[PDB]
Design an enzyme around this catalytic site. Structure first.
Site, PDB file in Angstrom:
ATOM      1  N   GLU A  70       0.818  -1.218   0.000  1.00 26.24           N
ATOM      2  CA  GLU A  70       0.000   0.000   0.000  1.00 26.24           C
ATOM      3  C   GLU A  70       0.855   1.273   0.000  1.00 26.24           C
ATOM      4  O   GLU A  70       0.569   2.215  -0.747  1.00 26.24           O
ATOM      5  CB  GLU A  70      -0.964   0.029   1.198  1.00 26.24           C
ATOM      6  CG  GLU A  70      -2.103  -1.000   1.153  1.00 26.24           C
ATOM      7  CD  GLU A  70      -3.186  -0.697   0.115  1.00 26.24           C
ATOM      8  OE1 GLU A  70      -3.136   0.362  -0.554  1.00 26.24           O
ATOM      9  OE2 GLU A  70      -4.098  -1.538  -0.027  1.00 26.24           O
ATOM     10  N   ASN A  89      -7.651   9.048  -5.641  1.00 27.53           N
ATOM     11  CA  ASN A  89      -8.558   8.104  -6.299  1.00 27.53           C
ATOM     12  C   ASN A  89      -9.341   8.798  -7.415  1.00 27.53           C
ATOM     13  O   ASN A  89      -9.462  10.029  -7.424  1.00 27.53           O
ATOM     14  CB  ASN A  89      -9.528   7.471  -5.289  1.00 27.53           C
ATOM     15  CG  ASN A  89      -8.815   6.778  -4.130  1.00 27.53           C
ATOM     16  OD1 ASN A  89      -9.210   6.922  -2.969  1.00 27.53           O
ATOM     17  ND2 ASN A  89      -7.772   6.018  -4.439  1.00 27.53           N
ATOM     18  N   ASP A 148     -12.517   8.986  -7.996  1.00 26.44           N
ATOM     19  CA  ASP A 148     -13.730   9.663  -7.520  1.00 26.44           C
ATOM     20  C   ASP A 148     -13.482  10.981  -6.769  1.00 26.44           C
ATOM     21  O   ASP A 148     -14.427  11.622  -6.309  1.00 26.44           O
ATOM     22  CB  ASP A 148     -14.580   8.707  -6.664  1.00 26.44           C
ATOM     23  CG  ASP A 148     -13.947   8.384  -5.305  1.00 26.44           C
ATOM     24  OD1 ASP A 148     -12.738   8.635  -5.099  1.00 26.44           O
ATOM     25  OD2 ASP A 148     -14.673   7.866  -4.433  1.00 26.44           O
ATOM     26  N   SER A 154     -11.582  11.258  -3.976  1.00 26.62           N
ATOM     27  CA  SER A 154     -11.070  10.942  -2.640  1.00 26.62           C
ATOM     28  C   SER A 154      -9.564  10.659  -2.677  1.00 26.62           C
ATOM     29  O   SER A 154      -8.974  10.548  -3.753  1.00 26.62           O
ATOM     30  CB  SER A 154     -11.839   9.765  -2.023  1.00 26.62           C
ATOM     31  OG  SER A 154     -11.597   8.561  -2.723  1.00 26.62           O
ATOM     32  N   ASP A 196      -6.231   8.410  -0.589  1.00 26.91           N
ATOM     33  CA  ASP A 196      -5.759   7.398   0.359  1.00 26.91           C
ATOM     34  C   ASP A 196      -4.562   7.956   1.137  1.00 26.91           C
ATOM     35  O   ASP A 196      -3.671   8.568   0.541  1.00 26.91           O
ATOM     36  CB  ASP A 196      -5.337   6.123  -0.383  1.00 26.91           C
ATOM     37  CG  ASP A 196      -6.513   5.365  -1.015  1.00 26.91           C
ATOM     38  OD1 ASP A 196      -7.695   5.627  -0.695  1.00 26.91           O
ATOM     39  OD2 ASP A 196      -6.240   4.471  -1.841  1.00 26.91           O
ATOM     40  N   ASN A 254      -8.841   5.607   3.145  1.00 25.44           N
ATOM     41  CA  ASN A 254      -9.498   6.453   2.166  1.00 25.44           C
ATOM     42  C   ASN A 254     -10.461   7.497   2.756  1.00 25.44           C
ATOM     43  O   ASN A 254     -11.251   7.199   3.658  1.00 25.44           O
ATOM     44  CB  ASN A 254     -10.154   5.540   1.125  1.00 25.44           C
ATOM     45  CG  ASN A 254     -11.425   6.088   0.585  1.00 25.44           C
ATOM     46  OD1 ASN A 254     -12.483   5.944   1.203  1.00 25.44           O
ATOM     47  ND2 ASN A 254     -11.349   6.705  -0.585  1.00 25.44           N
TER      48      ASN A 254
END
EC number: 3.2.1.17
Length: 129
Positions: A35, A46, A48, A50, A52, A59
């Site tokens: 990650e 991301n 959309d 958002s 992380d 998120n």
């Protein structure tokens, strides 16, 4: 902070992640590796809108407030920047809520694709645990 492999394992164990919801310590170390590369400061946008954040790439769509993910939730009741601290407490406590959510560690795409069904014990091999 960029953690050493065994360093993060120890910190995660101390914070009670070893076998949390049945997931051995190696699973958490493996997830953190793929990650964030053990880097608490890691961020990724991301599609959309958002983002992380942190060692476990938690998120903003659901778990934290970053002031720029409109119409999202803050289920861990934290600013997303708390997830970037050298102190992993916020990341670990939020991860505990995420993994309890009903999907377990499948919530982490890197875990499902790179850790699940593999010899995760290898990630804690050699560590003084």
């Amino acid at each position: 902070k960029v953690f050493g492999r065994c360093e993060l394992a120890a910190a995660m164990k101390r914070h009670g992640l070893d076998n949390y919801r049945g997931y051995s310590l190696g699973n958490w170390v493996c997830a953190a590796k793929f990650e964030s590369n053990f880097n608490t400061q890691a961020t990724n946008r991301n599609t959309d809108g958002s983002t992380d954040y942190g060692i476990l790439q938690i998120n903003s769509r659901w778990w934290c407030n970053d002031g720029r993910t409109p119409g999202s939730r803050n289920l861990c009741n934290i600013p997303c920047s708390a997830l970037l601290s050298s102190d992993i407490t916020a990341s670990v406590n939020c991860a505990k809520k995420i993994v309890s959510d009903g999907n377990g560690m499948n919530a982490w795409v890197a875990w499902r694709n790179r850790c699940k069904g593999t010899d995760v014990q290898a990630w804690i091999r050699g560590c003084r645990l």
